[PDB]
Amino acid sequence: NLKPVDAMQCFDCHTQIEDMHTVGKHATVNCVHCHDATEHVETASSRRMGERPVTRMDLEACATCHTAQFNSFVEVRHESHPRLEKATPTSRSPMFDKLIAGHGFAFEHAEPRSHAFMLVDHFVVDRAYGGRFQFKNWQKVTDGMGAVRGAWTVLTDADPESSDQRRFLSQTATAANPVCLNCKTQDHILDWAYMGDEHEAAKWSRTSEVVEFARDLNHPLNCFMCHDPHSAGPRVVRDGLINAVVDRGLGTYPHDPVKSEQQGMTKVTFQRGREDFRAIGLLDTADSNVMCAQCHVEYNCNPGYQLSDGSRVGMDDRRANHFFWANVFDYKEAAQEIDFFDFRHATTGAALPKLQHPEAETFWGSVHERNGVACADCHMPKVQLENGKVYTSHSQRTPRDMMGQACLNCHAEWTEDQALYAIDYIKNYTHGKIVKSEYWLAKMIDLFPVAKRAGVSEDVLNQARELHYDAHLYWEWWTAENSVGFHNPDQARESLMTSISKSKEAVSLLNDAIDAQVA
Amino acid sequence: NLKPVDAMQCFDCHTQIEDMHTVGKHATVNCVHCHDATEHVETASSRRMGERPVTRMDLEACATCHTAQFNSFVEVRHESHPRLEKATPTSRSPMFDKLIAGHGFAFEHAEPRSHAFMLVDHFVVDRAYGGRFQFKNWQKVTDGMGAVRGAWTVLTDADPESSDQRRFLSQTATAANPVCLNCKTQDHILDWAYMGDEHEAAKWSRTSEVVEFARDLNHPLNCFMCHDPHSAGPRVVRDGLINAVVDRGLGTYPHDPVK
Amino acid sequence: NLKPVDAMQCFDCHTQIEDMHTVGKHATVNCVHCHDATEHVETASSRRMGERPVTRMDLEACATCHTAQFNSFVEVRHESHPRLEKATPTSRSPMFDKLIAGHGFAFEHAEPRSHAFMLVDHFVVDRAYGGRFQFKNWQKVTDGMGAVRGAWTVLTDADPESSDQRRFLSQTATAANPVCLNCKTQDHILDWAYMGDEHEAAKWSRTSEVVEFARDLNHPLNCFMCHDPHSAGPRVVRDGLINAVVDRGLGTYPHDPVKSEQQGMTKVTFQRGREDFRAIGLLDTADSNVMCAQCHVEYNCNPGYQLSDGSRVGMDDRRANHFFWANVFDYKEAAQEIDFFDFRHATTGAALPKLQHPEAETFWGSVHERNGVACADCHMPKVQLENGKVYTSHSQRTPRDMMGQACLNCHAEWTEDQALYAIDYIKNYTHGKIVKSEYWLAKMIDLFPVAKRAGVSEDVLNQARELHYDAHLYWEWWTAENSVGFHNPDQARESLMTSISKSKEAVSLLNDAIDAQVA
Ligand code: HEC
Ligand code: HEC
Ligand code: HEC
Ligand code: HEC
Ligand code: HEC
Ligand code: HEC
Ligand code: HEC
Ligand code: HEC
Ligand code: HEC
Ligand code: HEC
Ligand code: HEC
Ligand code: HEC
Ligand code: HEC
Ligand code: HEC
Ligand SMILES: O=S([O-])[O-]
Ligand SMILES: O=S([O-])[O-]
Ligand SMILES: O=S([O-])[O-]
Ligand SMILES: O=S([O-])[O-]
Ligand SMILES: O=S([O-])[O-]
Ligand SMILES: O=S([O-])[O-]
Ligand SMILES: O=S([O-])[O-]
Ligand SMILES: [Ca+2]
Ligand SMILES: [Ca+2]
């Protein structure tokens, strides 16, 4: 059984914790729930840590007093089909392999499934660790509760004796690096300096051996990613997000200065040896738009190249951990501002961006966002009980499972079937334009080898490569983004029509040049 | 927001609470969750209460850290048919009126329904208070969460100016007395001496005016009826049961001395 | 009404029948249930048949005493979508037409449906008889009971006056031959010599006119294919299977000598004019793995060519009726051992194998097979009755229809939804790798005409053709095999990664050679 410690002892040295803990809704929650600091207190001085206290990062540390929220979070949605490859005719991107050739996602890119699995799925996907990690057997894929208890309770490592990234099966890649883990877990929150910069007090950084780092990590989506454990107040902890909102002064809502001021973020910094070490962003309000934007954004979390001179941009570079914080029509400018692209297309040779699930940036300026609706209203609504204490569902999933709470309370004019029909109208229309964008991109890509072999000039090929950048960006945003247009239907429409226009322009350019060589 | 108090200072006088609280699974749960003792601490000695501290008996005191248990308790089972008289051909006792004639249960004896309603149902049944108490209207019969928040949030008293047991409608009885309430609530746990015997320190006893007692009670089946709030360990609080098992030496299983 | 005959009369001449019938569970079942032998007994001698007795092969001969098993067998699973072409984007092999070009399956290859239809479906598929046979009208496609009563009760022949294989509609083929029928019916069990070799006593053989043979056949999947009618004991009757297990000494479990000895097969031969004529394989145990392996295997049942010199291998050759009895990683060696391939790819010119539903060979060495599980545990389980005599379901279908009996009795840790999710994880992952294997095969195939037209050498084209053999084998095994990886997920994964590797190797070889011609 837990025995309480005297927090006044701690507060003598930890004045920021004192100011947060004594004022918030955890003022009565004793430190012993999350820290074992007995030897620390015996050996610390006001400026030296002494013995390092143990800090619990397991979700069960919160589940004892908050069982309803924990249980709602860990539920597995079995209807969210698992390990389902997107590069198939029945999924999001039928022509993905041709369009993405040259990039590591060609090795595997599955649809998302329930949050319980995020860390294990990151470890086992074919593009990440060369197939080094597997579930202990194929039965363990069902075990959401086990994954939450810890990745290493359900996974195996093919070679515990080595720590290098290498292929263990032929059709795998080794794309994973330490930046990735910041959107899968924050078990490393006390061991990673802000942005992953080198730091004397940091065990792990952008340049660490990712296999060694992985072995130290266990829990998905820690509860404290959105809730300060000391004040219980709303926050973010993701470095890249704090960097965009606060350091670069872009604001929580870059298109709306007023909403940014009402619903802002305050950066709180913690030091080691009196040098800045790590930071959090305290939110003015419990704003799920910004909480979910810790991960559901377009980002760099990988090495790349410079647009200017084509030189390698390695993990050591700050740009390898970056939130662009830009909508699809501002993205090219944002990538130019850091002089960066992701890969060269294997067929066309074009410098190209790689887009990641940009839900937050897509949602900006949409009808729902403009009306003050937030991710949680549709994806984590309040539970409705005939007789009960209301709490917020933490099962972050499609509103199709809870249409009464997620849609119909606001849309009183609709039945469930009518609201579903409105969603499908948007998704069907947008998916049609995605498929057409892919048809035109593929037609363009396939002309590159024909043009090369016909002796078309490098100048013409480079003109087509510049068009490929835009044709790609204005398509891939929408196969990356998970709502199939629902979050912003007009923007999806405008972007996908632009993609098709760019590809058609490139097709015309190449066809004419090929024909001129033939004559 | 709650601010914790110095529990060690309490323990200078409260040695039984100290022994229970420091050892069990509520050792880290501060007294401020259930007690407002600021003036008490200022005025008490080990031999004098001073100002009486406030003690919370509402179930929400536990629901903050144990929402799953609270929500499962308060749920209303709509299939448990409400206000269903047992003395009918389709219920438990078709000839109950003839057989029970002379007893107060002849005025009304319904089948049980969900625990959330036990205190309000005790107050409104025709055999108990002469029909003095009613739900505010016939819609309120559904409101389990409201009854749990407190009986007087969902009930009305026909005559707040009098405190006597009498009939307000002809076919009612006044069978209720203070002993009844021990199986409906323990809001009176600090105001009732063991067995309801007369005691200088008891506001309420077996001989109190039950209408006055009723007005002072709010919550059904308090969570602490089965769980000690200090140790979190298993217990009972009902005097009559402790009297049978312990005082009269019958044991928890009178037919099995080993068990 | 049936009148019993004196079996002692028969036993004077039929001593093998005596030894089987008098000992087994049909010792009390009189010969008249299945034979009309009155004139036979009047005219036979100990070595000459005289008048041929009539033998019933209709399933109703068993249904009188075994109605439960019969009714469970004949049930139509309407959820098993009928006449569904696999070469479509929503089915098993979206790029099948490009990959299989040159082979008769390009004319039609539908998904399987319920066993009641196997003989009629064989007769009416577009690749088989040139469209000669049809159901009497499009309503008859529903009539499972009618198909079981007899194919010719529900089918019509476009030209009863001719017996040649020819096209009756333009986009059909005439792939059917007498070997095919051995996996659709055994009505011919007394009229076909072992392996279909020429024999004086055999009415039909590998070289027969298949249209004439077809007209003589009526019933699907006779009950006696797995149960000896005389002893009632477990057996197989399929010649190709007996040949692999017994004649070639490969064993019932080629990867496990011990299991092969515990669960073995005894070949029993019957003679005509004191010369070996036909055979059965009596099983040591009621082993559904080996019973279902009569048909659910990779096989030759067709003419082909020699790998060594490219010469035709006709129906007259023993190799036209062959069970390879080899897993995917042993198959190439098995085809080399008989010097055989199926077709030349229409685009690449590569010699290629054609793979057939290799469920039995895929199941070997899988986790379930290693734990002593058999096909019937998941596809024909015991019926569970609150009050009833237990029998074995004969409705051989997906375990999704009976998850309680097929999975959950063994997997107590799972709900039905969890077990379904585990199946889908495997099928989704494997199908993703199938689609990727097809993408790479298609990319390779499409380079052949480009290379040819650029003047690439025959030596390079032949190197690519050798790679095509392996790229094809390691892909097609999995579109042929019906579990979409479930029966052996690790093997599917290893094979499909090998396919992709081989195709990528060939793409690189051809691209480099084309580029060298251009420069
Ligand atoms: C002064 C003598 C201290 C006492 C009393 C307590 N802590 Fe401490 N702590 C102290 C220092 C100098 C440091 C290094 C960081 C800094 O602020 O200078 C720490 C660090 C921690 C940590 C972080 C550990 C990590 O892994 O990075 C924790 C969780 C922590 N301290 C907790 C803690 C508790 C619970 C205390 C009361 C029991 C406590 N500290 C007392 C200095 C001092
Ligand atoms: C019991 C000892 C608790 C532990 C362990 C955790 N929390 Fe808590 N939490 C607790 C209480 C008594 C309260 C106040 C309840 C009230 O409404 O009065 C809270 C509150 C929260 C909140 C809401 C805060 C707000 O300002 O609205 C959150 C978001 C919260 N708690 C989160 C949380 C986390 C993430 C925990 C694990 C690190 C955790 N709590 C543990 C009691 C206890
Ligand atoms: C936050 C900015 C992230 C970074 C850094 C990484 N990932 Fe991620 N990932 C993120 C989200 C919001 C999602 C779900 C939405 C979606 O579009 O899938 C994911 C999903 C995955 C998955 C599962 C789906 C799949 O692609 O198969 C995997 C396997 C995964 N992510 C791996 C991964 C790798 C290897 C990363 C570093 C190269 C990485 N993620 C970083 C958010 C973020
Ligand atoms: C990084 C730590 C994340 C935070 C914060 C949020 N999400 Fe997320 N989400 C993330 C990943 C890596 C995945 C894929 C997990 C996998 O194993 O594949 C997801 C997935 C989702 C989904 C799909 C769930 C399903 O049933 O398939 C949804 C609807 C979703 N995410 C929504 C969502 C919301 C609304 C968030 C703020 C409350 C949120 N996520 C935060 C990564 C992270
Ligand atoms: C960000 C992706 C979150 C994660 C990780 C966790 N919670 Fe959460 N929580 C989140 C939101 C948007 C809200 C609603 C805020 C509002 O006022 O609208 C909450 C709320 C809570 C509460 C408060 C009580 C309630 O409303 O239910 C608690 C106690 C709470 N959350 C606990 C909790 C636990 C235990 C978590 C890990 C399993 C957890 N939260 C993660 C957003 C996010
Ligand atoms: C948060 C500030 C709490 C308050 C308010 C209440 N309880 Fe509690 N309880 C709390 C914790 C942290 C624990 C330990 C959890 C663990 O398993 O480690 C408990 C435990 C209990 C138990 C279980 C006790 C045991 O198994 O020995 C019970 C029965 C219990 N709590 C009851 C309870 C009651 C009735 C409350 C209102 C008077 C109550 N708790 C309030 C945290 C908190
Ligand atoms: C609008 C046209 C109504 C219809 C249709 C139904 N109800 Fe009603 N009801 C309505 C009002 C305005 C009121 C009084 C509200 C108040 O708070 O003063 C009521 C009252 C009831 C009651 C209580 C009656 C009592 O004597 O105390 C009940 C039990 C009730 N309503 C139930 C009910 C049922 C079951 C209905 C469908 C048959 C129904 N109402 C329809 C308004 C309207
Ligand atoms: C000796 C005079 C016989 C008598 C008595 C019976 N049978 Fe016969 N049978 C006999 C011969 C020489 C043959 C040819 C095969 C052989 O073993 O040498 C047969 C064949 C059959 C068959 C197979 C018919 C076919 O189509 O191939 C059957 C089904 C059969 N016999 C049945 C049978 C029955 C039921 C008898 C008792 C009523 C019986 N036979 C008697 C020789 C002799
Ligand atoms: C009635 C005259 C029957 C005819 C016609 C068929 N079978 Fe039979 N069968 C019959 C009996 C009385 C029994 C024994 C029942 C018992 O359990 O004691 C059987 C048994 C079988 C078995 C089980 C054998 C075993 O060793 O376990 C099988 C597989 C079987 N029978 C198959 C079968 C076939 C395929 C039939 C048509 C050729 C057939 N039976 C006809 C009675 C009768
Ligand atoms: C046993 C070794 C077989 C041989 C010989 C033939 N077929 Fe077959 N066939 C077999 C099985 C186990 C299945 C079901 C599994 C599957 O993958 O489909 C089939 C299926 C068919 C079908 C229906 C499905 C389809 O392809 O449209 C047809 C029309 C069919 N088979 C025809 C056919 C022909 C023409 C054959 C000789 C060239 C032939 N089969 C032989 C098993 C076996
Ligand atoms: C040859 C005589 C076979 C034997 C012995 C077994 N199977 Fe079969 N199976 C065969 C064919 C030709 C077909 C396709 C029939 C058609 O008309 O398309 C099948 C089909 C199946 C299926 C699919 C059923 C569905 O609902 O779609 C299954 C699940 C199946 N077969 C399983 C199976 C089992 C487990 C067997 C041993 C008990 C078995 N089959 C034997 C051909 C033959
Ligand atoms: C009476 C008004 C009918 C309606 C309503 C439906 N059907 Fe029909 N159908 C009808 C007749 C008289 C016939 C020909 C019967 C014969 O044996 O001559 C049919 C035929 C069909 C067929 C076969 C078509 C073929 O081309 O061979 C099919 C597949 C069929 N019918 C199906 C069908 C469906 C699905 C209906 C509802 C949508 C339907 N029929 C209605 C008479 C009538
Ligand atoms: C192989 C593909 C089979 C076909 C064709 C038929 N049956 Fe079958 N049968 C098969 C198996 C795997 C089993 C279970 C054996 C075990 O002990 O596990 C059976 C069993 C029977 C029985 C025994 C009683 C029972 O378990 O139900 C009978 C009487 C039986 N089978 C009859 C029967 C009939 C009538 C068939 C044609 C419709 C038939 N079997 C075909 C495998 C196969
Ligand atoms: C007993 C007769 C079983 C039947 C029926 C089913 N399963 Fe099974 N399964 C069984 C065992 C003994 C094992 C190995 C257990 C271990 O931990 O060693 C399995 C394994 C699986 C697996 C994992 C396969 C892997 O390759 O790692 C899966 C995905 C699985 N089982 C699923 C499954 C399904 C869906 C079933 C019904 C169709 C099913 N099993 C039946 C034992 C038995
Ligand atoms: O209070 S923290 O800043 O040590
Ligand atoms: O914020 S900057 O990188 O445009
Ligand atoms: O790879 S993650 O960013 O989807
Ligand atoms: O500790 S109590 O008994 O005052
Ligand atoms: O008994 S059989 O061999 O004629
Ligand atoms: O059995 S042989 O053909 O390898
Ligand atoms: O053609 S049969 O072998 O599927
Ligand atoms: Ca990116
Ligand atoms: Ca073959």
mmCIF file with all atom_site columns, N, CA, C and O in Angstrom, chain C residues 249-260:
data_model
loop_
_atom_site.group_PDB
_atom_site.id
_atom_site.type_symbol
_atom_site.label_atom_id
_atom_site.label_alt_id
_atom_site.label_comp_id
_atom_site.label_asym_id
_atom_site.label_entity_id
_atom_site.label_seq_id
_atom_site.pdbx_PDB_ins_code
_atom_site.Cartn_x
_atom_site.Cartn_y
_atom_site.Cartn_z
_atom_site.occupancy
_atom_site.B_iso_or_equiv
_atom_site.pdbx_formal_charge
_atom_site.auth_seq_id
_atom_site.auth_comp_id
_atom_site.auth_asym_id
_atom_site.auth_atom_id
_atom_site.pdbx_PDB_model_num
ATOM 1  N N  . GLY C 1 249 ? 6.613 -42.799 -51.928 1.00 0.00 ? 249 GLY C N  1
ATOM 2  C CA . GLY C 1 249 ? 7.054 -42.922 -50.538 1.00 0.00 ? 249 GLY C CA 1
ATOM 3  C C  . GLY C 1 249 ? 7.223 -41.611 -49.788 1.00 0.00 ? 249 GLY C C  1
ATOM 4  O O  . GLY C 1 249 ? 7.968 -41.533 -48.810 1.00 0.00 ? 249 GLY C O  1
ATOM 5  N N  . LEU C 1 250 ? 6.542 -40.561 -50.250 1.00 0.00 ? 250 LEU C N  1
ATOM 6  C CA . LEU C 1 250 ? 6.696 -39.242 -49.614 1.00 0.00 ? 250 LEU C CA 1
ATOM 7  C C  . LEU C 1 250 ? 6.022 -39.147 -48.241 1.00 0.00 ? 250 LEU C C  1
ATOM 8  O O  . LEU C 1 250 ? 6.435 -38.345 -47.424 1.00 0.00 ? 250 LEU C O  1
ATOM 9  N N  . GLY C 1 251 ? 5.001 -39.971 -47.975 1.00 0.00 ? 251 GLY C N  1
ATOM 10 C CA . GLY C 1 251 ? 4.355 -39.978 -46.660 1.00 0.00 ? 251 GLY C CA 1
ATOM 11 C C  . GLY C 1 251 ? 3.194 -38.983 -46.642 1.00 0.00 ? 251 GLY C C  1
ATOM 12 O O  . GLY C 1 251 ? 3.108 -38.081 -47.481 1.00 0.00 ? 251 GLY C O  1
ATOM 13 N N  . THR C 1 252 ? 2.298 -39.158 -45.684 1.00 0.00 ? 252 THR C N  1
ATOM 14 C CA . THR C 1 252 ? 1.135 -38.269 -45.552 1.00 0.00 ? 252 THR C CA 1
ATOM 15 C C  . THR C 1 252 ? 1.561 -36.876 -45.057 1.00 0.00 ? 252 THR C C  1
ATOM 16 O O  . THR C 1 252 ? 0.897 -35.870 -45.367 1.00 0.00 ? 252 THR C O  1
ATOM 17 N N  . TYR C 1 253 ? 2.648 -36.827 -44.285 1.00 0.00 ? 253 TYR C N  1
ATOM 18 C CA . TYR C 1 253 ? 3.245 -35.551 -43.827 1.00 0.00 ? 253 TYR C CA 1
ATOM 19 C C  . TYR C 1 253 ? 4.727 -35.523 -44.196 1.00 0.00 ? 253 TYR C C  1
ATOM 20 O O  . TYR C 1 253 ? 5.554 -35.922 -43.372 1.00 0.00 ? 253 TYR C O  1
ATOM 21 N N  . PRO C 1 254 ? 5.069 -35.047 -45.404 1.00 0.00 ? 254 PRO C N  1
ATOM 22 C CA . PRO C 1 254 ? 6.464 -35.179 -45.859 1.00 0.00 ? 254 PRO C CA 1
ATOM 23 C C  . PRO C 1 254 ? 7.507 -34.524 -44.967 1.00 0.00 ? 254 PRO C C  1
ATOM 24 O O  . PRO C 1 254 ? 8.668 -34.956 -44.975 1.00 0.00 ? 254 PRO C O  1
ATOM 25 N N  . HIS C 1 255 ? 7.116 -33.513 -44.198 1.00 0.00 ? 255 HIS C N  1
ATOM 26 C CA . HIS C 1 255 ? 8.048 -32.854 -43.288 1.00 0.00 ? 255 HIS C CA 1
ATOM 27 C C  . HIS C 1 255 ? 8.121 -33.478 -41.909 1.00 0.00 ? 255 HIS C C  1
ATOM 28 O O  . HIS C 1 255 ? 8.869 -33.000 -41.060 1.00 0.00 ? 255 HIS C O  1
ATOM 29 N N  . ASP C 1 256 ? 7.355 -34.537 -41.669 1.00 0.00 ? 256 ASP C N  1
ATOM 30 C CA . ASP C 1 256 ? 7.311 -35.120 -40.340 1.00 0.00 ? 256 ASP C CA 1
ATOM 31 C C  . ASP C 1 256 ? 7.176 -36.652 -40.424 1.00 0.00 ? 256 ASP C C  1
ATOM 32 O O  . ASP C 1 256 ? 6.053 -37.170 -40.522 1.00 0.00 ? 256 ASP C O  1
ATOM 33 N N  . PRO C 1 257 ? 8.320 -37.379 -40.379 1.00 0.00 ? 257 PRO C N  1
ATOM 34 C CA . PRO C 1 257 ? 8.333 -38.852 -40.479 1.00 0.00 ? 257 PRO C CA 1
ATOM 35 C C  . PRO C 1 257 ? 7.510 -39.553 -39.404 1.00 0.00 ? 257 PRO C C  1
ATOM 36 O O  . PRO C 1 257 ? 6.932 -40.615 -39.668 1.00 0.00 ? 257 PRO C O  1
ATOM 37 N N  . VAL C 1 258 ? 7.473 -38.987 -38.204 1.00 0.00 ? 258 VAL C N  1
ATOM 38 C CA . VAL C 1 258 ? 6.786 -39.613 -37.077 1.00 0.00 ? 258 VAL C CA 1
ATOM 39 C C  . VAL C 1 258 ? 5.257 -39.502 -37.286 1.00 0.00 ? 258 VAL C C  1
ATOM 40 O O  . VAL C 1 258 ? 4.510 -40.513 -37.225 1.00 0.00 ? 258 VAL C O  1
ATOM 41 N N  . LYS C 1 259 ? 4.794 -38.281 -37.573 1.00 0.00 ? 259 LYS C N  1
ATOM 42 C CA . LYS C 1 259 ? 3.360 -38.065 -37.848 1.00 0.00 ? 259 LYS C CA 1
ATOM 43 C C  . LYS C 1 259 ? 2.905 -38.883 -39.080 1.00 0.00 ? 259 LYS C C  1
ATOM 44 O O  . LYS C 1 259 ? 1.801 -39.418 -39.107 1.00 0.00 ? 259 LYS C O  1
ATOM 45 N N  . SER C 1 260 ? 3.771 -38.983 -40.084 1.00 0.00 ? 260 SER C N  1
ATOM 46 C CA . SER C 1 260 ? 3.503 -39.811 -41.264 1.00 0.00 ? 260 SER C CA 1
ATOM 47 C C  . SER C 1 260 ? 3.270 -41.293 -40.899 1.00 0.00 ? 260 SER C C  1
ATOM 48 O O  . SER C 1 260 ? 2.428 -41.950 -41.487 1.00 0.00 ? 260 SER C O  1
#
